[PDB]
Protein backbone atom coordinates (compact mmCIF):
# COMPACT_ATOMS: atom_id res chain seq x y z
CA UNK A 1 0.00 0.00 0.00
CA UNK A 2 0.95 3.64 -0.56
CA UNK A 3 0.69 4.41 3.15
CA UNK A 4 3.96 5.71 4.57
CA UNK A 5 5.42 6.70 1.20
CA UNK A 6 7.31 10.01 0.99
CA UNK A 7 5.92 12.13 -1.79
CA UNK A 8 5.62 15.68 -3.12
CA UNK A 9 1.97 16.65 -3.16
CA UNK A 10 -0.12 19.56 -4.32
CA UNK A 11 -1.56 22.07 -1.87
CA UNK A 12 -4.74 23.00 -3.69
CA UNK A 13 -5.08 26.50 -2.25
CA UNK A 14 -1.89 27.70 -3.95
CA UNK A 15 -1.03 25.07 -6.62
CA UNK A 16 2.47 24.31 -5.28
CA UNK A 17 3.67 20.79 -4.40
CA UNK A 18 5.32 20.20 -1.01
CA UNK A 19 7.19 17.31 0.64
CA UNK A 20 4.94 15.07 2.73
CA UNK A 21 3.89 11.51 3.57
CA UNK A 22 0.74 9.59 2.72
CA UNK A 23 -0.87 8.59 6.02
CA UNK A 24 -4.14 7.06 4.81
CA UNK A 25 -5.84 5.77 1.71
CA UNK A 26 -9.11 7.67 1.87
CA UNK A 27 -10.49 5.71 -1.09
CA UNK A 28 -11.52 6.38 -4.68
CA UNK A 29 -8.21 7.97 -5.60
CA UNK A 30 -7.89 10.14 -2.50
CA UNK A 31 -5.12 10.10 0.10
CA UNK A 32 -4.56 11.75 3.43
CA UNK A 33 -1.32 13.73 3.42
CA UNK A 34 0.75 14.79 6.38
CA UNK A 35 3.04 17.48 5.04
CA UNK A 36 6.49 17.93 6.54
CA UNK A 37 5.42 21.27 8.07
CA UNK A 38 2.63 19.48 9.91
CA UNK A 39 -0.39 20.56 7.87
CA UNK A 40 -2.70 17.71 6.86
CA UNK A 41 -5.30 17.42 4.12
CA UNK A 42 -6.73 15.05 1.53
CA UNK A 43 -5.16 15.13 -1.91
CA UNK A 44 -6.11 13.46 -5.20
CA UNK A 45 -3.65 10.77 -6.28
CA UNK A 46 -3.17 12.61 -9.56
CA UNK A 47 -1.74 15.54 -7.56
CA UNK A 48 0.72 13.33 -5.68
CA UNK A 49 4.23 12.80 -7.05
CA UNK A 50 6.07 9.70 -6.03
CA UNK A 51 9.53 11.27 -6.13
CA UNK A 52 11.74 11.11 -3.05
CA UNK A 53 14.00 12.92 -3.83
CA UNK A 54 12.81 15.33 -6.47
CA UNK A 55 14.75 14.21 -9.56
CA UNK A 56 18.05 15.45 -10.94
CA UNK A 57 17.68 18.06 -13.70
CA UNK A 58 14.19 19.07 -12.48
CA UNK A 59 13.36 22.77 -12.34
CA UNK A 60 12.27 23.51 -8.79
CA UNK A 61 11.45 26.47 -6.54
CA UNK A 62 14.11 27.21 -3.91
CA UNK A 63 13.26 29.02 -0.69
CA UNK A 64 15.54 31.64 0.83
CA UNK A 65 15.30 32.21 4.59
CA UNK A 66 14.04 35.80 4.20
CA UNK A 67 10.95 34.54 2.30
CA UNK A 68 12.22 35.05 -1.23
CA UNK A 69 11.97 32.33 -3.81
CA UNK A 70 13.37 31.58 -7.23
CA UNK A 71 13.55 28.89 -9.87
CA UNK A 72 16.58 26.63 -10.05
CA UNK A 73 17.64 23.27 -11.43
CA UNK A 74 18.46 20.24 -9.29
CA UNK A 75 22.08 19.25 -9.92
CA UNK A 76 22.78 17.02 -6.91
CA UNK A 77 21.42 15.10 -3.95
CA UNK A 78 23.29 14.39 -0.74
CA UNK A 79 22.35 12.38 2.34
CA UNK A 80 23.90 13.40 5.65
CA UNK A 81 22.83 12.14 9.05
CA UNK A 82 19.65 10.79 7.49
CA UNK A 83 18.66 14.16 6.10
CA UNK A 84 18.32 15.08 2.42
CA UNK A 85 20.04 18.05 0.75
CA UNK A 86 19.60 19.37 -2.78
CA UNK A 87 22.21 21.18 -4.81
CA UNK A 88 20.33 23.76 -6.90
CA UNK A 89 21.81 25.77 -9.78
CA UNK A 90 20.68 29.31 -10.61
CA UNK A 91 22.58 31.32 -13.19
CA UNK A 92 25.49 28.88 -13.15
CA UNK A 93 25.96 28.96 -9.39
CA UNK A 94 25.09 26.01 -7.15
CA UNK A 95 23.73 26.30 -3.63
CA UNK A 96 22.64 23.72 -1.05
CA UNK A 97 19.09 23.58 0.34
CA UNK A 98 17.48 21.44 2.99
CA UNK A 99 14.50 19.40 1.89
CA UNK A 100 12.03 21.82 3.51
CA UNK A 101 13.35 24.64 1.30
CA UNK A 102 12.59 22.99 -2.04
CA UNK A 103 9.06 22.99 -3.45
CA UNK A 104 7.47 22.76 -6.91
CA UNK A 105 5.27 25.39 -8.53
CA UNK A 106 2.11 24.24 -10.33
CA UNK A 107 4.01 24.29 -13.63
CA UNK A 108 7.02 22.46 -12.20
CA UNK A 109 5.03 19.71 -10.46
CA UNK A 110 2.65 19.24 -13.39
CA UNK A 111 5.66 18.36 -15.58
CA UNK A 112 6.37 15.36 -13.35
CA UNK A 113 2.85 13.91 -13.17
CA UNK A 114 3.17 11.62 -16.20
CA UNK A 115 6.24 9.84 -14.85
CA UNK A 116 5.67 10.19 -11.10
CA UNK A 117 1.98 10.86 -10.45
CA UNK A 118 -0.33 8.51 -8.53
CA UNK A 119 -3.23 9.35 -10.83
Curated annotation (Swiss-Prot):
UniProt crosslink position (Glycyl lysine isopeptide (Lys-Gly) (interchain with G-Cter in SUMO2)): 79
Cross-link annotation Glycyl lysine isopeptide (Lys-Gly) (interchain with G-Cter in SUMO1), location: 79
Mutagenesis or variant effect for residue 39 to A: Increases affinity for histone H4 that has been dimethylated at 'Lys-20'. No effect on recruitment to double strand breaks
Region of interest (Tudor-like), residue spans: 1-119
Result of altering residue 11 to A/H: Loss of interaction with histone H4 that has been dimethylated at 'Lys-20' (H4K20me2). Abolishes recruitment to double strand breaks. Loss of interaction with histone H4 that has been dimethylated at 'Lys-20' (H4K20me2)
Region described as Interaction with dimethylated histone H4: 11-39
PTM field: Asymmetrically dimethylated on Arg residues by PRMT1. Methylation is required for DNA binding.
Annotated consequence of substituting residue 37 to R: Abolishes recruitment to double strand breaks and induces defects in class-switch recombination (CSR)
UniProt superkingdom: Eukaryota
Impact after mutating residue 18 to A: Reduces affinity for histone H4 that has been dimethylated at 'Lys-20'
Compartment(s) of residence: Nucleus; Chromosome; Chromosome, Centromere, Kinetochore
Disease listed for this protein: A chromosomal aberration involving TP53BP1 is found in a form of myeloproliferative disorder chronic with eosinophilia. Translocation t(5;15)(q33;q22) with PDGFRB creating a TP53BP1-PDGFRB fusion protein.
Subunit comment: Homoligomer. Interacts with p53/TP53 (via the central domain). Interacts with DCLRE1C. Interacts with histone H2AX and this requires phosphorylation of H2AX on 'Ser-139'. Interacts with histone H4 that has been dimethylated at 'Lys-20' (H4K20me2). Has low affinity for histone H4 containing monomethylated 'Lys-20' (H4K20me1). Does not bind histone H4 containing unmethylated or trimethylated 'Lys-20' (H4K20me3). Has low affinity for histone H3 that has been dimethylated on 'Lys-79'. Has very low affinity for histone H3 that has been monomethylated on 'Lys-79' (in vitro). (Microbial infection) Interacts (via C-terminus) with Epstein-Barr virus lytic switch protein BZLF1 (via C-terminus); this interaction is involved in the activation of the viral lytic cycle.
Domain notes: The Tudor-like region mediates binding to histone H4 dimethylated at 'Lys-20' (H4K20me2). Interaction with NUDT16L1/TIRR masks the Tudor-like domain and prevents recruitment to chromatin. The UDR (ubiquitin-dependent recruitment) motif specifically recognizes and binds histone H2A monoubiquitinated at 'Lys-15' (H2AK15ub). Phosphorylation of the UDR blocks interaction with H2AK15ub.
Annotated function: Double-strand break (DSB) repair protein involved in response to DNA damage, telomere dynamics and class-switch recombination (CSR) during antibody genesis. Plays a key role in the repair of double-strand DNA breaks (DSBs) in response to DNA damage by promoting non-homologous end joining (NHEJ)-mediated repair of DSBs and specifically counteracting the function of the homologous recombination (HR) repair protein BRCA1. In response to DSBs, phosphorylation by ATM promotes interaction with RIF1 and dissociation from NUDT16L1/TIRR, leading to recruitment to DSBs sites.
Protein name per the record: TP53-binding protein 1
Native species: Homo sapiens (Human)
Covered residues, full protein: 1485 to 1603 of 1972
Amino acid sequence: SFVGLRVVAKWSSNGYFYSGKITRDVGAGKYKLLFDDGYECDVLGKDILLCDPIPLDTEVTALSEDEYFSAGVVKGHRKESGELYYSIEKEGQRKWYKRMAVILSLEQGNRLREQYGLG
